[PDB]
From Swiss-Prot, chains A, B:
There is a cross-link at residues 59, 242, 357 (Glycyl lysine isopeptide (Lys-Gly) (interchain with G-Cter in ubiquitin)). Mg(2+) binds at residues 246, 295, 320. Homodimer. Pfam families: Enolase_C, Enolase_N. Keywords: Cytoplasm, Glycolysis, Isopeptide bond, Lyase, Magnesium, Metal-binding, Phosphoprotein, Ubl conjugation. This is Enolase 1.
Length: 436, 436
């Protein structure tokens, strides 16, 4: 039974405060550290920030921590809830909040408790967390599926100087036969990319962004993709490694058109592209490079351009800003056949139960699910166990650099070793890992 | 009693393989992850690397992992050693190796076992790791001392483009009253530095090095220090934050002289400085900026320049490359009165026992001890508990960015909270934390 619930302020990978929750039961203390989320959020669960410009530049979580300690904990303790009953945990928390976006107690306060409980239930049942999450999500467990990691290697858009408007370039070692081999190949590609980067752009270019990728000053999409192809080739893994893109197109959508030179800042509007023109540019890249996944190719509310594109895409299309892990939004996305993969961000919805339902609804529509990290990550490895528990076959948790990223990748190494013959690597079937 | 010893390959914060050890006792499985070290090392313990250019670019640790599993484990299990007897653990490992630099089994293989055992002994004794390390080192425990963190904020030298030859610039919030306050102020300085950096040098300048600091293209030492002073001022903590420098001068020592434009690469030798001229340049900086610590001001074998400088320094002088955590070297450093602080890198010597003896010898000579991270760090928080156990009052474990760095800083937050009135923050007495 839960005897104590406590929260404290700790730091995320960007050096901003975040909430750490510890839940005590008869079996020990279980901890969860929440990643940073959004405090202003239409369609998303809102994390609570202090707003006191005199402390942490207005990003403290003292209120949130207060909500956990002074409000949730006494209630939670008295409710006597069975932690093995995740939905009972979550319904309890939501009910305590009473808002649609968890803006009363804060999504960061609620999520912290929701995840710690799941750790505590696994402890109780005596199984690894991933097996517990498999149970709660009703996933097949014969065998378990290890994911292809979509590794961030290079960043453009708002994350870099240069003209490049596309935000993220990832490599996915779909050709490996095991998770350990996929990670080894993926790191070799990364290191070669870093050497090529420093060689062509300067020692400066070799420094990393928040998720571990480089951000040289690149002018075009072909420039970025050529660099990546060279790195793949240099490591000797041509054919075994595919590319994934995150266009984050909402960043350059203006006046109903897409500004590919949005950093311009005298960007010629005669050159802005309509949805259809932009689709032609993607088709182009898709023909020359081994791209197998494109995230957010169109803006968050440009439904017609997604639908249009989806018709002829032929590769996985991932919804991130389109859906913001919001069930009403997902439902519409499915209905409009706007894409076929959901980027899942647990702190965007706020509870583990609601995260699992969103994945289940996706799977039921034939969609794939890509479990994702956040910009501000922590040393907590939760999403590693969650991608295995959900059997999605694909995770986006950063480059093979920066331990808030490697902590998850190292955790997948351990899980893979622990399962022995009871695990298969998703490989080329990443899109539909749930059905392997 | 130890029933099993196992090792596996996992990744460090740079994406290179490292060794993870798990030790099983009647109380559970205890893990340790070793940071990356040197495989070629005169005066230092050598970590073992595979050297197979076809895998991980020649940086695998499969041999090392083999050494643990096939060689150390069976021996260790059969020896029946009391893990509470750290020296018995370590002597056993060393004896198994039989070399002065652990080049037979590999320092990475030995260290992994040495640290896991200490975790297992704490478990057994039923105390937090830091209390166990306090016991083993015979440190005062009334009260415990929390360290001033020397946070990396900006890098030059080999770590950056630009002319700046000095390698590391750190801030140390000596003016805070608690570890939590020191970390909060230190992060505020860091964030302001990042904004100023991006504003003056470009979005590019805002990307981070291996330890979390920025590396804009800076030309001079005054340029770097002015930027830092502006950041301190901008955050409103003038007076509460001091500067620490790591000159890593061995990198620019050539022909008996110091090349401050070593990146030149037409560096005018008419401009190279002798030890004495270089001392004058430091005295200069020391008069204009709030510098309270200087690491490696002179080259690894330039004994006369350290001695000379030390005479008039008046601030803490830290030996890193001079000593390479090597007891014979330390002894000479003490004897020559070359410095008054030892940079302690546990994997540089290879065992926890030998790490504690090196600190004890330092303290006995009146020296301070700065516990340090490595370039290639992991999610393991070991050095957090070790700096508290040793009562040094000072740690260098990176910027408040990148979780391999924040994992330690978050761990110090937890320790501080756990100790309540039994802890004091070293503050301005960091140099001699052991004697508070
Ligand atoms: Zn996205
Ligand atoms: Zn140094």
């Amino acid at each position: 039974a839960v005897s104590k619930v406590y929260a404290r302020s700790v730091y995320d990978s960007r050096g901003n405060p975040t909430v750490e929750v510890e839940l005590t039961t008869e079996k020990g203390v279980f901890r969860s550290i929440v990643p940073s989320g959004a405090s202003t959020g239409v369609h998303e669960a809102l994390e609570m920030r202090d707003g006191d410009k005199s402390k942490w530049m207005g990003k403290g979580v003292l209120h949130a921590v207060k909500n956990v300690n002074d409000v949730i904990a006494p209630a939670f303790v008295k409710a006597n809830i069975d932690v093995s009953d995740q939905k009972a945990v979550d319904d309890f928390l939501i009910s305590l909040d009473g808002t649609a976006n968890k803006s009363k107690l804060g999504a960061n306060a609620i999520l912290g408790v929701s995840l710690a409980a799941s750790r505590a239930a696994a402890a109780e049942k005596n199984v690894p967390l991933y097996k517990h999450l498999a149970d709660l999500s009703k996933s097949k467990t014969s065998p378990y599926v290890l994911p292809v990691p979509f590794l961030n290697v290079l960043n453009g858009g708002s994350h870099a100087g240069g003209a490049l408007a596309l935000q993220e370039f990832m490599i996915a070692p779909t050709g490996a036969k095991t998770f350990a081999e996929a990670l080894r190949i993926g790191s070799e590609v990364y290191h070669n990319l870093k050497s090529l980067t420093k060689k062509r752009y300067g020692a400066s270019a070799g420094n990393v962004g928040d998720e571990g990728g480089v951000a040289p000053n690149i002018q075009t999409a072909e420039e970025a993709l050529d660099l990546i192809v060279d790195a793949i080739k240099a490591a000797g893994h041509d054919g075994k490694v595919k590319i994934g893109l995150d266009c984050a197109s909402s960043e350059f959508f203006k006046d109903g058109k897409y500004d590919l030179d949005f950093k311009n800042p005298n960007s010629d509007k005669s050159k802005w592209l309509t949805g259809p023109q932009l689709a032609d540019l993607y088709h182009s890249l898709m023909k020359r490079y081994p791209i197998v996944s494109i995230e957010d190719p169109f803006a968050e509310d440009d439904w017609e351009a997604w639908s249009h594109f989806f018709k002829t895409a032929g590769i996985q299309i991932v919804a991130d800003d389109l859906t913001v892990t919001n069930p009403k939004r997902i439902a519409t996305a499915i209905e409009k056949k706007a894409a076929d993969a959901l980027l899942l961000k647990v702190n965007q919805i706020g509870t583990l139960s609601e995260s699992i339902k969103a994945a289940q609804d996706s799977f039921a529509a034939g969609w794939g699910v890509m479990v994702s990290h956040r910009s501000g990550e922590t040393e907590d490895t939760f999403i590693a166990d969650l991608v295995v528990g959900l059997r999605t076959g694909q995770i986006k948790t950063g480059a093979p650099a920066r331990s808030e990223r490697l902590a998850k990748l190292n955790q997948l190494l351990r899980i893979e070793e622990e399962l022995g013959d009871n695990a298969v690597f998703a490989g080329e079937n990443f899109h539909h890992g749930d059905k392997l």
